[PDB]
Design a protein around this ligand. Structure first.
Ligand SMILES: *[C@@H]1O[C@H](CO)[C@@H](O[C@@H]2O[C@H](CO)[C@@H](O[C@@H]3O[C@H](CO[C@H]4O[C@H](CO)[C@@H](O)[C@H](O)[C@@H]4O)[C@@H](O)[C@H](O[C@H]4O[C@H](CO[C@@H]5O[C@H](CO)[C@@H](O)[C@H](O)[C@@H]5O)[C@@H](O)[C@H](O)[C@@H]4O)[C@@H]3O)[C@H](O)[C@H]2NC(C)=O)[C@H](O)[C@H]1NC(C)=O
Ligand SMILES: NCCCC[C@H](N[C@@H](CCc1ccccc1)C(=O)O)C(=O)N1CCC[C@H]1C(=O)O
Ligand SMILES: *[C@@H]1O[C@H](CO)[C@@H](O)[C@H](O)[C@H]1NC(C)=O
Ligand SMILES: *[C@@H]1O[C@H](CO)[C@@H](O)[C@H](O)[C@H]1NC(C)=O
Ligand SMILES: [Zn+2]
Length: 595
């Protein structure tokens, strides 16, 4: 009979937590939109106040015999409340951690480098100045300059802060009785075999990655020459069109299977048609509403930041989506540019927004993703259909396109340069941090431990020799900003499970029909695919994630079958092409990190 009282306790507590988290989120928004010493102080002081309340909440849960309850729902809510995270730390330790975290994120956001050609102009930021060069320049010495300048300033400058962060993250995890921060993060997936599952899936897809890597290296040798790219060594990462070599789509024009056949790049047509950031977001909104999903509320349009501010202010430009835990107060902060890549980013971020809107009726503790990978997958499912020649022709961004066998391979390869290449990258981000959290790497070996993983899994390496005098991991946003990365590995796998099922539901994919291939499916306008999204997303975290997956397509298991199915036509072509051209596969151990 205690359950009746507990039910009323939770109902009230959830609403209180939403209200208190609203205040924290507003402060965090203000700081991210506007980096100042005063906003930093405000963000961290509100966080400390919320942490103190959570601690009292965790303490109060012991007054309830919640493990004895009949209701799985009540038990699930109470269990969520016992998990404190960083809030478990002593008052002083939590304050220090907050200061360390803001030091790292603000350092990242304030990085400025000098122009390669003009050592007087020193106001080039990553977004958009440096990223523009990395994506567009084919001058290998220019690329190497910007790589070194950025990593030195975004990575190395923050080593001592990162070290204290690891220490306090570990202390926090242990106060929650996890072994380390690795176990704390993994707890979000509610499955004690989750690591092994991902190792198994990765092993199945790894051979395809090896083939893509080999072919790209072959093509880069033809472009840059053997003085710059070896046949048998790891690929110099500054040549891959991305600061972290996480996705290689930006160099597709020089590595495309059939260069005389069409390669989709709609950036120029977007500009020609007078596209704006506003129009891009309106188009994303249109896609969701077309599937009978929820329209963006007025607060979104009023309060979002969709262009980089033109005043002198510092801010976090790294695109993000925000839930304020009231009703319909959801926002995006994106330094939007008019490019194809940015159009996908718009859809990714709007996927988060849709999830927020779908579960906003749930009790506070359930107002989050089924697991962190689910949140990341939503927007990418739409991006997959947006990226198709089918959809791009509908919106008039792709003209005079003939979709023959060769054009199809180009498009599949372009997609793989984003989707397959990313898998080892994503895995290494957390394998690295897990190894630090678990105390498996001595402090003397922290930098080369990072590059060892990037070599082992991705077969890439720095453009210049690094050592333990450098510290390169925090040069990636999520590492400086303490954002778990496994969510993205999970997302890139399960988004294909979602995409395939949504395509089947939309009547857009049949494995026995040549006219309905998975790689040209467009789910625009499909209420049937939208219904599946509604069924899943409306659950939030009310049930363990296999139940959320089951609500979508009746499946309960994370599987690499769907991603492999999507790329199967590419795998067949590429294996044969690599044999035809005697392409070397695999790589020697890198010499670019001195121990
Ligand atoms: C992470 O793991 C930690 C363990 O490694 C864990 O820390 C333990 O939490 C326990 C609370 O659950 C706590 O147990 C209490 O111990 C008290 C005395 O211990 C002190 O002296 C010891 C010397 O012998 C030292 O070793 C300790 O460090 C302590 O200083 C007891 O006084 C206390 O008892 C009371 O509470 C129980 C409540 O239990 C329930 O009560 C209800 C009543 O409604 C029953 O129906 C139910 O069946 C159940 O019994 C009462 O039973 C009892 O009458 C007393 O009122 C209690 O046993 C322990 O001290 C603590 N540390 C260690 C080292 O064990 C953390 O909590 C974990 N953290 C998280 C977040 O989970
Ligand atoms: N040109 C970059 C746009 C970035 C878009 C996206 N941003 C992240 C931001 C995450 C975040 C967590 C906590 C606080 C603040 C922000 C996202 O998942 O939206 C992202 O990082 N993504 C999208 C998938 C891959 C991953 C990346 O790029 O590494
Ligand atoms: C940023 O914050 C400062 C104080 O920290 C405030 O005075 C200023 O108005 C803010 N800038 C913008 C553009 O909102
Ligand atoms: C739109 O969604 C509602 C429920 O949210 C559903 O009942 C209805 O069938 C959907 N519209 C169409 C045309 O399917
Ligand atoms: Zn995301």
């Amino acid at each position: 009979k205690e359950e009746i009282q507990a039910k009323e306790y939770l109902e009230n507590l959830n609403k209180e937590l939403a209200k208190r988290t609203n205040v924290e989120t507003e402060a965090a928004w203000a700081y991210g939109s506007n980096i100042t010493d005063e906003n930093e102080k405000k963000k961290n002081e509100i966080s400390a106040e919320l942490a103190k309340f959570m601690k009292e909440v965790a303490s109060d849960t012991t007054k309830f015999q919640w493990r004895s309850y009949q209701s799985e729902d009540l038990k699930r809510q109470f269990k969520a409340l016992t998990k404190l995270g960083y809030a478990a730390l002593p008052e002083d330790d939590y304050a220090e951690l907050l200061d360390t975290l803001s030091a790292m994120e603000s350092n990242f956001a304030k990085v400025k480098v000098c122009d390669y050609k003009d050592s007087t102009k020193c106001d080039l930021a990553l977004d958009p100045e440096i990223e523009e060069v990395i994506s567009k320049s084919r001058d290998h010495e220019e690329l190497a300059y910007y790589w070194r300048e950025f990593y030195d300033k975004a990575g190395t400058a923050v080593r001592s802060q990162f070290e204290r962060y690891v220490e306090l993250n570990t202390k926090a995890a242990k106060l929650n009785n996890f072994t380390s921060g690795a176990e704390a993060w993994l707890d979000e997936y509610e499955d004690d075999t989750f690591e092994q599952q991902l190792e198994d899936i990765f092993a199945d897809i790894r051979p395809l990655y090896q083939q893509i890597h080999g072919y790209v290296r072959f093509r880069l040798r033809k472009h840059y020459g053997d003085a710059v790219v070896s046949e048998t060594g790891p690929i110099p990462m500054h040549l891959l069109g991305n600061m972290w070599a996480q996705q290689w789509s930006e160099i597709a024009d020089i590595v495309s299977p059939f260069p005389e056949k069409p390669l989709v790049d709609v950036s120029a047509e977007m500009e020609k048609q007078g596209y704006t950031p506003l129009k891009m977001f309106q188009m994303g909104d249109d896609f969701f509403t077309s599937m009978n999903l929820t329209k963006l509320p007025q607060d979104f349009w009023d309060k979002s930041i969709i262009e980089k501010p033109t005043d002198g202010r510092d801010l976090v430009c790294h695109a993000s989506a925000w839930d304020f835990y009231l009703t319909d107060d959801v926002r995006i902060k994106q330094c939007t540019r008019v490019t194809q890549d940015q159009l996908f980013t718009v859809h990714h971020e709007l996927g988060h927004i849709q999830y927020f809107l779908q579960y906003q009726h749930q009790p506070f503790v359930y107002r989050t993703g089924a697991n962190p990978g689910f949140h990341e997958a939503v927007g990418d499912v739409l991006s997959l259909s947006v990226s198709t020649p089918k959809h791009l022709e509908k919106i008039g961004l792709l003209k005079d396109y003939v979709r023959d066998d060769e054009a199809r391979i180009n498009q599949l390869f372009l997609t793989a340069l984003d989707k397959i290449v990313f898998l080892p990258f994503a895995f290494t981000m957390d394998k690295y941090r897990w190894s630090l959290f678990r105390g498996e790497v001595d402090k003397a070996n922290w930098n080369c431990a990072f590059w060892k993983l990037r070599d082992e899994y991705s077969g890439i390496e720095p453009p210049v020799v690094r050592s333990e005098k450098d510290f390169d991991a925090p040069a990636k946003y999520h590492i400086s900003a303490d954002v778990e990365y496994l969510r993205y590995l999970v997302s890139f796998i399960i988004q294909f499970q979602f995409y395939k099922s949504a395509c089947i539901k939309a009547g857009q994919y049949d494995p026995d029909n040549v006219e309905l291939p998975l790689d040209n499916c467009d789910i625009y306008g499909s209420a049937a695919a939208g219904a599946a999204f509604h069924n899943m997303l409306s659950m939030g975290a009310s049930k363990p994630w296999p139940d959320a997956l089951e609500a979508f397509n009746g499946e309960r298991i994370m599987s690499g079958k769907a991603i492999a199915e999507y790329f199967e036509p590419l795998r067949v072509w590429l294996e044969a092409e690599n044999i035809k051209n005697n392409v070397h596969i695999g790589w020697t151990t890198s010499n670019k990190c001195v121990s």
